[PDB]
Structure formats: C-alpha cells, structure tokens
Design a protein around this ligand. Structure first.
Ligand SMILES: CC(=O)Nc1ccc(CCSc2nc(N3C[C@@H](C)O[C@@H](C)C3)c3c(c2C#N)CC(C)(C)OC3)cc1
Lengths: 580, 155, 578, 578
C-alpha cells in the first residue's frame, strides 16, 4: 500500500457542492510542488464533509509527506469559511483500514448509546489519539454538545430569531478576561492584589436555560428555556453502534504509516488499562475486532436511504450471524452511519469476531467459507450492496471532466461508458461506478428585492435558515471540566417538511416579524450527495474486473478504446491498483 | 525644451553643485519642471541644498514657481526646517503668504512641524498670522492642537 | 551556493512603507529559533510585494530549513493584515534555478496575456506539475479574476459608494450551508430527507451585472452593471509580457531534487506535445530557456509609466529582430519586472540566441552581440538600456543601527558614495543596488471635518483603497473552477490628482460628501523600495576594485570610509563578500 | 535527556481558569497524531500565560518533534481567542536551564531599568534569538508599548468609554493601502505614476495625544490627551532586574536541544560585539552567568505575595552576597518576577558569579561550601523558600479522572499529604509543587439590569477588561520598529474595590451608567495556577525517601496511600520517576 496523507474538514449543514466550491477546490489548488506525489483524489459530501487523499510513491518518508501537504494546506486556511476552520481541519498519515476496534458497552443498561459515546469521546479518545503509532481514530458516535432546540412559534411570539439566540449565547456563555485589582504597575504602597473574575463559561442545562433573551415593556422576562428545549446531545446524530444488539460506542483505530502494529496495539491496551479503574459502574471495554479470527461486512444502500432503512439491513445482517452462524461467531459490532465509504446515512459496517480456531473444526467453519456463505445469504437483500470479506485483479478507472462540462454532462458520459462496457461481458465484468447517484434537493431562492423592500438583511436570512435547518456551532462551554461545543438547531418537528419553511420568521430593521415565505420561493431539483475529484478536476470513479482469464492489461485496453468514443472534453486516467 | 533641463532637475535633487554650475553655463532651462511641477529650485529647497538655491536664483530661477498642487519652493523649505533657505527665498522675493490648493501657507507648515525660527522669519516678512486654510485653521489653531506652547506664545 | 529560503507576500494597493511596517517587520521579528541561519535580507516595494530571503550555512538541508521557516511564518499569520493572509504567503527554496521557461503565445491576435494565462492555469499547469521529475512550477500571470471596474459618477448619482458595492457582492455572490429537510435527528417515521440549496456562487459577468445594489423610491432598480463595467481579467496588471511582439504567458519549471535534467526536460516536452491538439487557435508553445540566453535591462526615470517603458522595450525588440536577425531566435520582453526592483519604469528583455552552430565567427557570439547592442542602445534617451550576459565585485550593506530612519540612512549612503568616488584609483562603479526616492501623493484626511460631516473614517479609507488600489472581495466559480473577484475603479477615474475629488462618500445622514471636502494633499518624496538586512533598515551597495587592485584592498577601503559615517550607521558584508 | 517541546501563549488580563478553558484545553485536545510523545503537562496562570510541555521518548529527533507540534498547533490556532492569537504563540525545543545571561547596565546611570529593557528588546534580542543554537531567550524586562493610561472621571465627563478610545485608536493610528496615481491597468497616454500615501502609523506620544475622540455640541474638541496620560512604557511591568544593586536588563539564553554549548556561546558573543559600537553612551554589557564559577539562588514566596515583598527578599539575598561573601562573589544579577518556575509576582532568581577560582583558595571558598552556607543563611527568611543551587527523590502527579473539579482535587491532595506526613520514617518533605488558592474578586454582571438600562454586555466587558486588565489595540512605529499599543486604566483608578464604581458605560440612549448600577461583587478563593497532566486536571507532588530508605520503597508507599483516595482520583509518576 503506497503511503497516503488525508486532509479532512467539516462544514456543518453544508451540501456537497457548497463543500466542494468553498473548501475542497481552495485546498486542492494549492496541492502542487509536493515531492513524490503520485495522485490526489477527493470526496465532497452532503454530510458537510470533505476528505482529500494524497498518495505518495512507495518508500516516501511519511513525516515529510505530511509536513509538505500541511505547508500547502496553510495557504488555503485563511480562505476557508470560519465554520470549517473552527471545526478543526485535520491532516493525518494513516493506513486506510482499521488496526482494531475498542467497543464500549454498559452491562448495567444504565447508559444509552449517546451517554456511552460521550463518555468515550470525553474520557478515552484523546489519550488514545495521542498514543504513538495511532494514525487516525474514529469515534462511533458523538461527543455531547449543549443542544439548544429552538421552537419557531415561541421565537415568533416574542419577536425573536435564531440570530437573537446566538447573540445571547455568545454574550451570556462567555469567558471574560477582567484583569486585577492592584495589578502592575500599581500605586506604590499597594498591598491588595487579586484577580477579577467576571463571567465564566456555563456548565449545565440549567444555566443555559436561564440565559435572558429580552425584557418585555411590561418588565416580564423571556428566558432561553421559553423558546427552546435544552439538553446535552451529540454534536451530530449520524453514527450509532451496537455490540451483539446492545447499545455501544467505540473507537476505530488506524495505524500511522510505517508504525509497528504489535507495539501500537500493546500501547493502546496499556492506555486503556489506566482508564478502566475510573469507569462509572456498568461500563465495560470489549474487543470486537483485532486484526485471522475476524472479518467485516459492508452495507451500502442507494443515496436517499434513511437511517431507518440502513438499520433494517444491519438488523438482517446481525440476525444472520447471531442465528445462522451462532456456533462460529463470537460477536458483531455493527455501526449505522459509517462504513468503507466513510460517513453517510445509507452506509454501515459490521465487525465480526469469530470463536477460537479450536472451536470451529472443518473448512466450512473457516473465515473464507463463512464469508462466502454470508455474502451469498446477503446477495438477495433488495436495493443494497451487502458483502462479507476478510481484509487484487480489478481495475480502477477515473472518468474526468477536462473542459468545464459540469456534473450533469459528466454523469451522461459515465452512463454512456457503462452501457458500452455492458456489451462486452467477454472482456469486462461488473463495470460499475464507485459513487452515489443524484437525489432530490430543495432549492430555495431568496428574493433580493423583496428582502430589501422589507428591510430584512441577507445575513439574518441566512443565519436563520442555516441555524434552524442545519445547526450552528455557536461557542464552547465546560461540561464536567471539559471544553465542549454549543449548537443551536430547530427542534426536529419544525424542520421536517417543506411547509415548515414558512413557520420561521426573521426580524426586519423596523421590528416587524417577516415569514420566510414573504421573500423566498422554492422548487425540487436534482443534485449530487457526493462530488468526486481526481487530481483537482471533477471525476467519477469506475471499478470493474477483467472477464475470466483475460489479463488486466487487455481489460484496461478496451476501457481506453470505449473511453476514446466519449464526448469531447471527457478524459480518463488509471488510479490505485491500475496506476502501475 | 531641453534634455539639459532633465539633467538639471536630477543634479539639483541629488545635491551636485558643480554639475548644476556646468549645466547652467551650457544653457539648461533654470525653470525646467518635472511631471509633478517641481523646478530645480523646488528640489533644492526640499532637499536642503543652500548653495544650489542661491546659484539658481542668480540665474533667474522663478522664486514663486508653483507645482501642480499649488506649492512653492518656500512651502517646501519652511515645512522641512531649512532656515537659511527660507531667508534666501524671502530675500529674493518669495511670496510669504502663498497659498497652495488646500489654502496652506508656509507659516501653517512651519507651525505644524514646530520650526520656531522659521515661524519668526516668516512673520518678520509679513506672514498673515490669521490666514486660514480650507478647514478654517490658523497657525495658532495648529499650535493648540499639537500642544506646542512655545509656538502658541509667539502667535 | 548556500541554500536559501524566500518568503513572498502581497498586499494589493499597498506602498512600500505600508508593506514594510505591517508585514515585513512583523515576519522578521518572528524569524527566531531557526537553525543554521547566516543572514536575512528583505525588500518591500511600491507594488505591495515583500520578499524575505533567509540564507543558511553550506550543508544545511534545504528542506529542514524550508519547514522551520514556514512553521515560524505560519505561527505569525494572525499578526498580518487580513488582505495579506488572503493572498497567500509562500515559503519556497529559492537557491534552485530554472530547468526551463516555457512561453505560451497566441499568434493569431485573438487572445490577451490574461486570456492565455487563464488557459494555462486551468488546462496546462497542473499536468506539468505532475510530470515526472518536475518540482516547483511558477505561472507568469494568473487565472482570471472577475473584475468589477467602478464608475464614481454613476455611484454618486445613486448615492452609493464602493463600500455598498463590496457589501452587495458579499451578500449576492455567496454560498453558505442551509441544512436539510428531514435531517438527523429526525421525527421517527420521516421518509423525506433532502439537502436545502440556497444561494450559490455566481458564475458569469452577466450574473454579476444583475446584483441588486438598491431600489429607488420611484421603484427603479440600480444594478451593479449600472455602476461598473464587468469582465474576466487578471488578478494583477503590473507586468506586460510579449514574445517577438505577441502577447504571451509562461511557466517557469524547476527540477525536483534528485531527478534527472535531461529526462525531465524531455518528459515536459512530451506532455506539452500531447496537449497541443486541444489548444485553441493560434496558441503555441515556445521554449526560450532550457537546460545561450542573455538579457537587456531597461530602466526609465522616476515616475515613468508602463506605456513609456513599453515603447523602449519595443525598440529593443525591433533592434534584435532586424539588426540581429541572423543571431536571435526570440526576444521575451517583460515590462514591469527588473531584478533591481519591480515597477512601471523597469523592464527586461530575455533574448534567446540561435544554435551556436548557426552563428559562426566571433562577431556572432554573445560577447560581440551584447557590445553592439549596448552601443546601439546608448542612443536611446530617457532610458538606461544595457545588454549583458551572466568575482572582482563586492556586496556591502549599509545599516541603520540606532533608529535613524530612511532619510538619514540615505544621507549617510550619499556621504559614503561621494567619498568612494574620491578614490577612483581603488574603487570603480560604487553604486546603490536599490532605488531612489520618488515623488508621492500624500493625502491627509481631516478627522474633525469627517466627524462634523458624519462621514466614517472606515468608509473613507475603504472608498479610497478599493477605488484606487483594488480590493479582493470574495470568490466565484468560472466554468467549474474557483477564482477571485476584485473591485477597483475603472482606469480613467483613478489616474490623476483631480480624479480624487470625483469620489464621494455617504455620511450617516445620507448626504454624499466629495473627498475634497475632508482631505488635502501635497507632493512629497518617499521610497518605492525599502530594504532590510538582519532585521534592520539597510541599503545594499555594489562596487568593484580598480584595475590592478584586489577586492581585498577595495573592501578594506570601504571599511575605512564606512568608519567615518554618522553616528548610528554600521555595515556588513553579504553575498559574494561573505 | 528526553527532548521536550514547549508551547507558550498569553492572554492579557486573563485569570488562570480563563486561560485554561479557552486556550490550554483547546490546544491539548488537538495534540494528536504526533509521534513518540511520552507525556504532556501544562500550567495555566493568573499572569495570563500558559506553558504546555510535551516530552518525547529518548532518542526522538527534536526537529521532527517540534515540527509535528507546530503543525498541529497551526491547525488549532483558529480555535483560540483572537487576543491570544495576536500575541504570537511560541513553540521551542530547548533545554529548561540557562546557558548564559547577558546583562546590560548603564554605567553613567543615565537610563532607567525600563529604558534599558526597551533598548535590549528593540536592538539586541531579535539578533540573539536568530543565532543558531539559541533555543529560548527570556528578556528580563519588557519592550516599550505606547501606553494609553485612561482616566474614568474624564471619560465620564465627556460621555466616553474605553470602547470609544479603542475605536478611535484603530481609526487614527492606521496604515492605509491607498493605491497609485496612474496605477495599472492605466489609461493610454498616462505620464505620471506615483504612490498615494494616506494614513500612516503614529510614532510618538504627541501624535497619540492628538487623536480626536469627539467634537462637542459647541464645536470644542476632545483629544485623547484630555482623557488619558500618554507615555511609552512596558507591555508589561512584571519583571525587573538589577546587577550588583544597579538598574539592569538582560537576556536569559537557553540552549537549543542538541546544539553545542561552546559554539552557541561564542556565536552569541560575536553577535554582541556587532552591536556594542552603536550603543548609546553609558550602555554596557556585563556577563553575570556563564555556564564551578557560578550558581543560582531561587526565591519562591507563597501565592499572593506582592512585587514589593519579593523585592525585599531578593534585596536580603543580594546583600548577603555583596557583604558576607564579597571576597568570593564578583556579581549578582537578580530578577524579580521571574523564577525557576517562570513568571509570577511571588518569584525571583539571582544569578551569582564567583571571582576567579585561583583567588578563592580553601575548600570553604568553593561553590559547594558557598551554596551550602548561603542556603543556611537564607533558611530563616520568613514565608519564602530561598535556596542556592547549580544547573533527585520522586515526582508524583495526582490526577482528576472523573470530572471532579479543582476544589475536590485539592481536598484529595491534602488527604494524601496528611497521610504522607504520618510516615516520617519512609517519606520526607512530601509537598505540592504548585500554588495555593488565593482571594479573588468575583463580579457578577446583572443581565436584567443591563438590558433594562440599554447597556450592552460587550461594552461592559470591554470596559472592565480594558481598564483593569489592559488591552492590546494595534501596532505603532517607535524609532522605526513596530511595537504594540495598550490601553489600560491609570494605576490610581484600578487599585481598590470601590474604584469599580467610578467606571461608567454609555447606554444606547446616550446616558452614562456607573458599574455599580448593574453589578455586584464578593470575595472568593480560586487558583492562580491550574495544572494538567496528559490532558486532565492534576496536582504535582514532590518528595523523597526518608534517610536510609530506597526511592522504590518510598514510591511504593506513595502508591499505597494513593489507592485509598476518594473515587475518581488517580495518579501517575513523571519526570525522574518515570
Ligand atoms: C504577467 C507576467 O508575469 N507575464 C510574464 C512574465 C515572464 C515570462 C517569461 C519571460 S522569459 C524568461 N523569464 C525569466 N523570469 C524569471 C522570473 C523569476 O521572473 C519572471 C518575471 C521572468 C527568466 C528567464 C527567461 C527566459 N528565457 C531566463 C532565466 C532563467 C535565466 O532568468 C529568468 C512570461 C510572462
């Protein structure tokens, strides 16, 4: 595996195109003048995530690659949205696969999945992330934040917006540098010296609840708990895990490039041994995947698939292992919302651990035959790519927009190539896109003339929409001595349907409350939930196989001939296993 | 007219006294002006070259030549604290109350930089102590704003 | 050659003192804790550019040096003006030379240098960067920017200023996160999940033209196209380049460390061959330099303009292409660039000779060509024009050690140069490496008048800066690729002092106030290029020993002369003389 | 030695908890993916400073360690308060002990301690800091800033606040990029090109004094000098030095990890020799501590001690060496406000330089016997740990593993220390390495009353912090060098609790509101120095094996005692015990 550096960033509430055009492109335009670079690829997703992977020639010093990529990233940093910079951009030098998973459960049932995930994020992850040889750590869940879940009816009733909520939280959840009595230089002869302590960060839902939003003309008070439900809850709600069907969280650990696997695994266990004696009651570490005794199952649904549907398919897979394979399988740690494709609502993964070598006699109880049978049983699941494998001869093709054609034309060109490839089962098998299809999206046009006539500012319009429907990271607070985030977002029931758009009011310069419907219009359209790029140009990755006993070479040759017939401005390249 | 004009502008700027005497001898226009309207006399006054000043005036240099923003060699000498030059210009007929495009006079400029002897010489030669610039300000207002009480005495 | 690292930063519309005092000094003060540093030198200029060069001991690993410099620079980033941070502050190994300079020309008269540079940026540069053996690739030009060229007469007519234009572009050329319908955590049983797509970045001059500035009381709309001309153009207009008189862009290509020169040159030429079929009409690749090129320097007087320099460069080009038609393959004329300084009154012609084989006789070799060229060019009046090819010299720094300031250091340098001129038996051609002070337009904003009128000083300074210097507002998407948006005055409203009073600012009460109401101006002298050496103000002095004297004795004299300079002035030897 | 990388940052006017919760925890959470890191520790102090020490495995390359730290910190910079980012964060790879001290005095007594410190900061420190081998340089004093010392009676008289002062300084001490006459792209036929110079940084107290705050109803002017005293003075006033009793400053120099001590020291001397010829008259370099020959004396008073009492202890130490040991001691360089454990009002250090070895005959006149006599002589100074030493028992960290909080952790520490004291046969001098809680003035702003009166929370918090803590506004140019501008209350208005009530804030309706109308206050205890270890709240505990016991036995007992502490309190061994 040639070494890879990955750049990761996050823009909460952002669609794939917004991520691509305000983050990914800005970074990629600086990714040149880096030594021993073979290629770069990126994904920009409607989870508001970007990942850029830079792949280096074998034998490259990974420290030096990481340094040189970060150097170029710093050119782009001041041009990125503040919302992205504040989430913390990461630059990692890791293997792309997991060395182990550390699962955490509560055998007293006294902690939910969400509680466990916060415990792991708040008391365990950081120490593991600093352990030498740990390249990347994935939390299977989310740290708590303070969640302010706004009610638009209540806000409108008091002539308040989400801008007023955000402003108040920044003003009343504050950590103030206030100086000293008697500080230097003093009046000579001064004896008293003391720090002044003024506002300090809030620590509890109770304090957030009594933030004072306004004082009415009659003297009554509107507090934040009068317009919002206040609770601790995940920074996000996209990743949920289970261990043998019970609530769990965990850490997926990847090895740093070139680091020693035995040693690093051992350092991880020694760090976990320091934490264990301080766990709350019931909390227990489990070891669902140590790299053979193990394998994984990938679940990939179509784009558009809800969390509930992915869960339904994960339930089938876990059901199969816990019923059909219960003599071979020790455990299943299943994760909805994260998979081999990274983070996404239509994706999951199951980590499967087998019983002892000794307790599984016969070929038919070894990992190959178990995974073969599993894949076969899951081959009939409708509208889902589910397969089981432990851990060569395909090809890995990039179709590239080389003329500013745009996503829609690139899709047409891809479909043309895929249909042509389908007419050669003698040379090519299962030629298919690696990516996701376009899905319906809700296009909203803000009318500038109406906004200006009414005296509603564009910034207020955008903050109201983005904060309500996407969530806004406001500032930090201190939860049980740890710095954590504060997020404002609509309560779920006010951001589910198109007609809810009109229940949100913005305050004009003259004090009148104006509904979103007065200055906006909307329509359904299609767009991409995952935009791909290859060496900085829009691209679409196509996987496939040489047919039985044709060389990869002949297979690649035909793809190139078929590609030579595509519309002008569409080119191609080979990557990964096909690059040499 | 002259290629020699341009060389005289440069020699005066860079202080080269011999070169100025030579170019004059060979016919250079003493009132040659650069793109901002600065004459050799302006340049010698700004950069403090006293002997170049005297040499230009004796060869007919125009003592009240004004640049494209209305400033004269005396403005420049007074602003930059070149006392001996201020006296020579005034001795050779400089307009002591010349106003630039902003209504600024040599006394305003001397007063602003706290050049007290220059303020004194200008005043001997008849500088209007109450002359106002475009904002209505006098030399006295300048002294008050800068907190220069020695200057405020004299006015 | 000792390894060297260069820091480059840009402050659009900034003068040399502004750049020095908000960027250069701040970076320099943060250049500590770096290993093996011999010396540091900088220049800050009237094009708003700074270059700081750190020179390391021989044998220093240049990669380690580059990363240590870069890390310290990056920790100083928050100390720099936003406008500088937004341009990118680059830190590169600078002691490596070019493997090749590739010219990209258009021969059929259909493309400007900006058009060609955009084509190169979007379609060629990155393929060349990925070419086997290539290290750094520099584009000589930029990708397009969206240029909004403002008209102050139209702005005033609608009671608008550049501040309103900038605000409107940030509001209406925008792309922000708008969340999802049915997103997590959802009401359980939700079936619809869809991204919300709100405003998207503008993609064309037409879309910029329709930005709504305001609606009048009688219901008429003022659009951005009613107060500005709108076009794709360059990010910067300081340099104009021509190849045998035709517009041209270019790529400067360096060899990656450890790669083979010949194989890398051939790989570049093979990659450019494969691109050729896709070029638009008249685009051609030329190769002026590739591992017999010589240079012709052009220097016009103080305050001379680009068009005046262009006229001289055109005479230099015409000379080589007629009088040296048997020896000269090409003249790459670069107006605005000069090695001794950037600016409108300087240029260089890079002259590429035909193959040695086709130039028999001594009269057709570089020495004789350059002597003939220099003799023909000594006719040219209103420019110094010198042809030359590339140790008796010395490289001396005069240093302000006690806070004396620019005007005093310059008088000290002049004393030293006059004294060195009195010893023609020992010293020849003792001169400044840098530039002389030039006239500047000093404008003073009257704070009292501004406050009495209710005109904000930020509105004043933004109006002046945006109009006359230009401002990078935000980014747009051109044919799928992110690029910059700039606002600036249309050229004809920012040329001369009288144009200042055509700009109006809007007071808190709504009245339009002309600049003449609250400002005054005058001519003064100041520097177009400020130099520093080891963190202190400096002036570099070049010179050589007289015939039949060694540099040793000539240096010794310079030290004796330097020892008589005013209190607080020191010196040091640098470069070849280190 | 395991190599250590240190991160230092500062937040003017912040208390320990503010520093810890907005800076220290943020950086620590982002110190991931760094190779070979053994442990991390931090202190967050009431001086507004943090120091985070990352210690790497033996044999780690300290260059790579430093680079990895710098890069992770760079990515965490946007998460820190702007006030911190704008001070500069530093990251150093150096030994924790001094290699040498460069002292500076004025032999003609014509420059004060404050003047000397500015001279060193402004003319000497940066060149030393760039010298190869120099890992860290501590100035024993402070560089000048432009100090705007605000008067709340005059601000209130003119209906102004520190917010108005800050806004005016930003507007009127500004460096403006204003473009060019005849700038590119130009019109055809343009003859003139010249820089436009608009506002420039102020350079003198006189210029700051005339900043125009407002124009009254009748047209009288309110200048900054009408509400403030304007003077050059230190950016801070925390560190004051003396050399043999006379005013001094200097540089404390720490050797970069892996550099050569003799080579570095010689490079420093060569750099000082370039500066000496340009010193103002009277200034002179002394050498009070070159690493036999030398030793140090630590002075550590309890938290809460004033600058004045620390000074009184240092005067006793200095007096002892210059009278009782005058035959053995050549010099004493004493620093009030900096100590072995860095910066604080309650700490000092004295560097002692002995006369030649040859002139100190007798075992009784050698470093060992001298330090032992001095330590004995200083052992009866009241409420101060004072000892003489040259640059091993155990090093224990008590750790908050469960969100317990500072108060509970202090209780657990005290329980452990009480238990340790009951085993004087096994453990001796079991003590905290840090500082005890002290009284602090807790002020609550009443949000209801503020809203009722129309007073902004931002105006209140700026007013309080700027007046009582100081605020870095922007930069200015002092004698050609960029330096800082600070606004703060003049001393007499920020000394006592009743002074809080003389500060007025302007409400939205224009009325002036005193602080007393919307606030209340009380005394409470809190920490002047919060410690963390591997990212968790911690308290360091030192001690040793009792006479005739091994270190292992004493450690084993410490662990046994630690196993009986309240739930959620853990421990770890560090430093010499790791
Ligand atoms: C807008 C713009 O910058 N246009 C532009 C500028 C330069 C060029 C390339 C001119 S050809 C050339 N340029 C050089 N440079 C070097 C660079 C650092 O600076 C630029 C402006 C041009 C150098 C060489 C040639 C040739 N042949 C030869 C050599 C390597 C010896 O010296 C540098 C093309 C377009």
């Amino acid at each position: 595996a040639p070494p890879a550096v990955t750049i990761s960033a996050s823009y909460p509430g952002a669609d794939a195109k917004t991520v691509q055009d305000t983050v990914t492109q800005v970074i990629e335009q600086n990714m040149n003048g880096i030594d021993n670079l073979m290629y770069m690829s990126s994904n920009s997703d409607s989870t508001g995530t970007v990942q850029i992977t830079l792949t280096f020639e074998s034998g490259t010093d990974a420290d030096i690659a990481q340094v040189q990529v970060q150097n170029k990233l710093q050119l782009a940093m001041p041009l990125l949205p503040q919302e992205v910079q504040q989430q913390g951009v990461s630059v990692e030098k890791s293997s792309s696969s997991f060395l182990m998973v550390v699962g955490v459960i509560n055998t007293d049932g006294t902690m939910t999945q969400e509680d466990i995930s916060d415990y792991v994020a708040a008391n365990m992850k950081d120490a593991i992330s600093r352990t030498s040889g740990v390249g990347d750590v994935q939390l299977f869940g989310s740290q708590y934040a303070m969640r302010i879940w706004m009610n638009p009816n209540e806000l409108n009733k008091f002539q308040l917006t989400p801008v007023d909520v955000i402003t108040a939280i920044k003003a009343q959840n504050a950590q103030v540098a206030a100086g000293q009595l008697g500080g230097t230089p003093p009046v000579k002869g001064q004896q008293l010296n003391a720090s002044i302590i003024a506002q300090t960060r809030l620590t509890s839902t109770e304090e957030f609840g009594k933030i004072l939003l306004k004082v009415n003309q009659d003297g009554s008070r509107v507090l934040l708990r009068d317009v919002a439900k206040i609770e601790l809850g995940g920074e996000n709600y996209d990743i949920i895990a289970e261990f043998n069907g019970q609530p769990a969280s965990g850490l997926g650990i990847k090895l740093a490039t070139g680091a020693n696997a035995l040693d690093t695994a051992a350092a991880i266990r020694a760090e976990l041994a320091k934490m264990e004696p301080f766990f709350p009651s019931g909390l227990k570490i489990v070891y669902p995947y140590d790299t053979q005794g193990v394998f994984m199952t990938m679940v990939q649904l179509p784009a558009g698939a809800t969390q509930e549907r992915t869960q339904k398919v994960l339930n089938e897979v876990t059901h199969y292992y816990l019923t059909k394979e219960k003599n071979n399988v020790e455990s299943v740690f299943a994760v909805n919302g994260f998979g081999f494709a990274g983070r996404g609502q239509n994706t999951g993964i199951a980590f499967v651990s087998l019983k002892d070598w000794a307790d599984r006699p016969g070929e038919e109880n070894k990992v190959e035959a178990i995974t073969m049978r599993a894949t076969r049983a899951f081959s009939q699941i409708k509208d889902a790519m589910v397969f089981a494998f432990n851990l060569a001869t395909g090809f890995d093709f990039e179709l590239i927009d080389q003329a500013g054609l745009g996503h829609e034309k690139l899709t047409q060109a891809r479909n043309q190539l895929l249909a042509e490839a389908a007419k050669h089962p003698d040379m090519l098998t299962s030629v298919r896109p690696n990516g996701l299809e376009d899905t319906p999206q809700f296009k909203i046009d803000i009318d500038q003339e109406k906004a200006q006539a009414l005296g509603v500012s564009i910034n207020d319009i955008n903050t109201t929409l983005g904060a309500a429907w996407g969530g806004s990271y406001v500032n930090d607070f201190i939860d049980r001595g740890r710095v954590k985030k504060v997020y404002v977002m609509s309560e779920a029931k006010y951001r589910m349907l198109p007609d809810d758009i009109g229940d949100w009011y913005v305050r004009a310069a003259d004090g009148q409350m104006v509904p979103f419907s007065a200055f906006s219009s909307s329509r359904w359209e299609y767009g991409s939930p995952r935009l791909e790029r290859y060496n900085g140009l829009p691209s679409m990755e196509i996987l496939g196989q040489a047919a039985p006993g044709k060389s990869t070479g002949e297979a690649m040759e035909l793809m190139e001939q078929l590609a030579s017939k595509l519309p002008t401005g569409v080119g191609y390249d080979w990557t990964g296993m096909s690059y040499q | 007219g002259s290629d020699l004009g341009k060389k005289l502008l440069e020699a005066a700027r860079a202080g080269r006294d011999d070169e100025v005497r030579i170019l004059m001898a060979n016919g250079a226009d003493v009132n040659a002006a650069d793109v901002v309207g600065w004459t050799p006399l302006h340049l010698a006054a700004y950069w403090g070259h006293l002997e170049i000043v005297e040499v230009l005036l004796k060869n007919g240099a125009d003592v009240n030549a004004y640049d494209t923003l209305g400033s004269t060699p005396l403005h420049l000498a007074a602003h930059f604290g070149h006392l001996e030059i201020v006296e020579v210009l005034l001795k050779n007929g400089a307009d002591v109350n010349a106003k630039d495009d902003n209504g600024i006079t040599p006394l305003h400029l001397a007063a602003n930089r706290g050049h007290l002897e220059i303020v004194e010489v200008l005043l001997k030669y008849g500088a209007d102590v109450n002359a106002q610039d475009k904002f209505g300000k006098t030399a006295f207002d300048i002294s008050i704003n800068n907190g220069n009480e020695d200057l405020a005495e004299i006015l």
